[PDB]
Nucleic acid binder design. Sequence first.
RNA 1: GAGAGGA
Lengths: 1104, 42, 105, 67
Amino acid sequence: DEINTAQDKWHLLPAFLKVKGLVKQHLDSFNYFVDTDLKKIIKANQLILSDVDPEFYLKYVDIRVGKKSSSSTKDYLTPPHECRLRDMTYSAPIYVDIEYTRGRNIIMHKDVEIGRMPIMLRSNKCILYDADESKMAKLNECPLDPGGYFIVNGTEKVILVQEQLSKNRIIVEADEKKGIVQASVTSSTHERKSKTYVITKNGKIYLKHNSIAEEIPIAIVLKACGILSDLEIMQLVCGNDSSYQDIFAVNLEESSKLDIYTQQQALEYIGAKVKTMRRQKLTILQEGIEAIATTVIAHLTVEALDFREKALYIAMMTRRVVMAMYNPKMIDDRDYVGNKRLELAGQLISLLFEDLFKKFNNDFKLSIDKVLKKPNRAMEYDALLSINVHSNNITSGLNRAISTGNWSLKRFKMERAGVTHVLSRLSYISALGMMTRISSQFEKSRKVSGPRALQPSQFGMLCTADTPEGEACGLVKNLALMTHITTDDEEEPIKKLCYVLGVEDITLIDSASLHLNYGVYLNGTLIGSIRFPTKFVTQFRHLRRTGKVSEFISIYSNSHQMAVHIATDGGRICRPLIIVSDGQSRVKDIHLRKLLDGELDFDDFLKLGLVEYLDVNEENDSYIALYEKDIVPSMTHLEIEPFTILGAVAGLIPYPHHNQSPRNTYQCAMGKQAIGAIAYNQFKRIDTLLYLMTYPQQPMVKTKTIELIDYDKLPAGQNATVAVMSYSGYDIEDALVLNKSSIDRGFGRCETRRKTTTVLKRYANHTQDIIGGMRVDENGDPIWQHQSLGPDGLGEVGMKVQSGQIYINKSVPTNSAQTQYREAPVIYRGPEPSHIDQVMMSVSDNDQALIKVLLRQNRRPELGDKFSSRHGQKGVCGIIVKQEDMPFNDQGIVPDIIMNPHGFPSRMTVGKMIELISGKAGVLNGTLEYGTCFGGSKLEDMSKILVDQGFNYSGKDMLYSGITGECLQAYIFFGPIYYQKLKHMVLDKMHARARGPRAVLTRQPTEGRSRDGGLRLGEMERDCVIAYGASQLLLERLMISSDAFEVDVCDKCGLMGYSGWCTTCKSAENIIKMTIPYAAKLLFQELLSMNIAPRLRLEDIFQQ
Amino acid sequence: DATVPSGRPETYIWRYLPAPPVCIRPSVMSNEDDLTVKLTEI
Amino acid sequence: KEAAAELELLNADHQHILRKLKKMNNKPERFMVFQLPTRLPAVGSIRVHKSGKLSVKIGNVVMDIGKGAETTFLQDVIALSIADDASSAELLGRVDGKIVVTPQI
Amino acid sequence: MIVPVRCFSCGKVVGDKWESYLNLLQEDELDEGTALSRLGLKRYCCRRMILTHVDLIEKFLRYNPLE
RNA sequence: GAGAGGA
Ligand SMILES: [Zn+2]
Ligand SMILES: [Zn+2]
């Protein structure tokens, strides 16, 4: 057989996902962290000193995770599922090297644990690393589980990928609302992060800062930065354009209006208004130099006698500002994807561990100084006790910060909340889509329609259909299939490579000719100017393709400002693309054959320079072909496949290129909450809330994406024989008509598993909690409340429990602050009976009893349950009708679901009709058809198969009415559609209250459903009641049925009294009893607690 | 309005704090609410 | 477009620098400044080809095809020296232009 | 988990055929369509009951707590 | 308390 490139180039994605899986940002980031940043931070804080005893120091020679000394074997870790069940924390010990001196001046070594770092699932440290279907089975781990999430306190917490603006990059925004433009740079070092704005006020360029006083003129700072000629300023900010010099001439005379300046004088002026404080006495000029040396731009530290780099950086910022001034629309959009970076779990954990390690070292040094402060007999033996004392602190802080999601830091004074999310377990696609999720840095973005739009620059980088619809509709995004997040490759070698490539350095180009040719910017800072930019770009790209440099170093050309940018920092989003030479591609139809054979695992494709990683910015310089047949002899890249523009979730949809986009978005939203198979160990798992499908079925119309994410092995749905027809009237608006006698045979049958935990804590008074129970009434036998408890006080496995029906008879001492045991049993408070199927008893690390009881409840598709259609056609079960009262074809098939035909004409889900036809044709032909974005099984072939079997070419059979027994006067769209049952079931949503618990404060009904509370009739509802002009109903609803209080108001001083006693007049003669809402009484008392007196004045209701 | 008592400019300066009833500031599970702590500090 | 203009400019710079090298054969005080890749690959010759093509070599066979640095001017640049901290700073003269070389593929 | 005993739309008893179906794919390897038709599954409801089925219980039984 | 469906 001959390989066809146009239909076999798509096989690179399986290779890409095998070598670089879907969950690779978390895994690779954490592996890089544990392999590099541990030792980096160790060598950073490698020394602790003291004011006394100069011959005493601790040297951290080396650090390892899970590796005691040589060992030759990773230390034994608790398996992840054991940690999940026992509510422990999955972690590995950290062993460091020790170098502690002695009074005899002897250096000795040790290897001691310093803490326990949590281990990300399926990382280089986890035991699941390289486990194949037998080790995973023996460890109760699902082979198809994504990984990348931590197990802390027995909870699956995932560090979501955080998007942010690119650090150390110039972002200029023209606020025309006032005529103001700016040039701020959030330079971010490992220690400092500050914004150096360059605003434009009074047509005059300034430079604000968080460390200087107010609006320093730009000419002065340019003189202080070294460029004092006052004419090189005009040749660095305006070049030779006449229309720019007059714009910038206004602020060039502010270096002489106040007084003429020199470099020292300008430094003194900038340091005079420095708001930064000095902990040691420094001269104003000395501090001012610092204000230019490091304080102005943390990104660039000029630790030399020449500040030309920083001066030219400020000059380029001013040049950009002047360009914006002369003509707007030359600014750069902040929402542009190339201007954003993605920080994964590795970097965040690096920051947290660095903070914790520096705090630990400070505490250890303080303790060492305290112990050694004694003038005599200051022994050094057992100097490593306080380290093991404090080793609890580091691991406790790490686990707590990961679990709670509040990352408290002090070095940067940065506080971020909600970094870690509890891993979602509803379907398989839900748990996979929670991974590879991106959270916007914007808090709310109330009306700003910028960050919430779909930027075209994210084509292939982000899923252009998957986004929490609602209040985060545009803020939260998800990675696509073909997408690799970069990491910091190098910074120093690339400068030497550029200098070899033929760019004159920054200290050898005059300001006059600096704007006459392209200047190459390396990672945002000007390096030099090089003639022939095209030759330089081509040679650098060739060097990158041949493997000389890292594949993630992206070089591109900007012509609006003549520049050749080179980006090397990590966090850039990159995707693979096939390199095409003049006119033709580079796959050459024989590398595909080798790939299919088993060699060239997408890495020899990079080594041989057939494919390359393009980030968002490098795509500006490229011309990309969608298909090989469109390659004109000018394009420089080719798409591997256009259906990778959709994420893992969006791959569920069949024929997504035929639907309307909001339908695809709704499907991406509601496919996570579709009940179905979750994992292979879903029965060995005790989770808070699991929804399971009794008989899950593989979809008929598959997708090339769902084979790669293994959605055909753990599906969530069933192939319902849908008849698209208006039937029974109970399916008007999105409502469905479920078919009885199919629910009976098992269709939509589901299961709900809920865990209940109990901790038998040991109090400080040496008193435990006893689970003793099982009372007996007369003639033996257990009482009704204990009828399903068992002898040991833990509910028998397999029994049935109802309202009441204690299944954990826990008793607690009354003297916790042993005979007096107050009984505090765990009572199943449910509306329907559920069965006990698992009871696990164990202990945690601290040796305290822990009992987890799992209650299973088998649920039937009752009326009012929500079913989706994998196209955004969500609906409720309007009616359940018997089999005979249903249309039937010539063969006697009756539909399982009768979807209304009105869902289509206004939502344009033609993809659903094509799915029905393809599914019917495939099932008649006995094969699974493919509905994939931009392709899939063609309609003509499916219609040919449909007409070969004797069915109509359009899939419209002719049915017989089930209640009159005659033909339906219109042919009925009839065929299998993959319908998925969603978790929003009416059994969990029905809720009613007559009387019950009331709030302690305002004596009003509680709010939730776990507390029997009423429905809030808020401001909008009372306004609606006002509109009808219903006064007695308003009074009854908002006073009588909500909170009524009989108060005693004094007729003289309108203050409420108790028991007919005014307490102020002390007469009880003017007291009058009347009923007002308790909320009003509370308000009156709170006003009287302030210096406000709501004195109620009364008048007779009667007497005319 | 100076016609009635308490209609004086000197009644708007804190000389006596009305301590609200414990019903307004109940103790939860002890764990006193904010107002009790604030007036204890006062 | 860009490639053709770059090639024409490179040919113009080749002929211009050949003329400059021929013209500055007189040696009163004039210099010229070269930029070379570091690491010293190990000399060679600036071998001129037909139709005004210039290339250089080193002891290793390597044809660094890069000619013509910035034509920057209005910056008077002169070269001096240093002699063992004694009476020194002897003015060696000014430079006419600059050449930058680059290894090719 | 396992094959449904009865095909929801019609009622045919499709539970017994599953094993047989597997044999028709393992020994004397037919196509799925011909194997389904040879088992008497004429209506496409019974066909999609067997063809589009995941035998999850095979994977579940790898984690039995009484080995 | 704050993470996220949901209509
Ligand atoms: Zn009174
Ligand atoms: Zn059937």
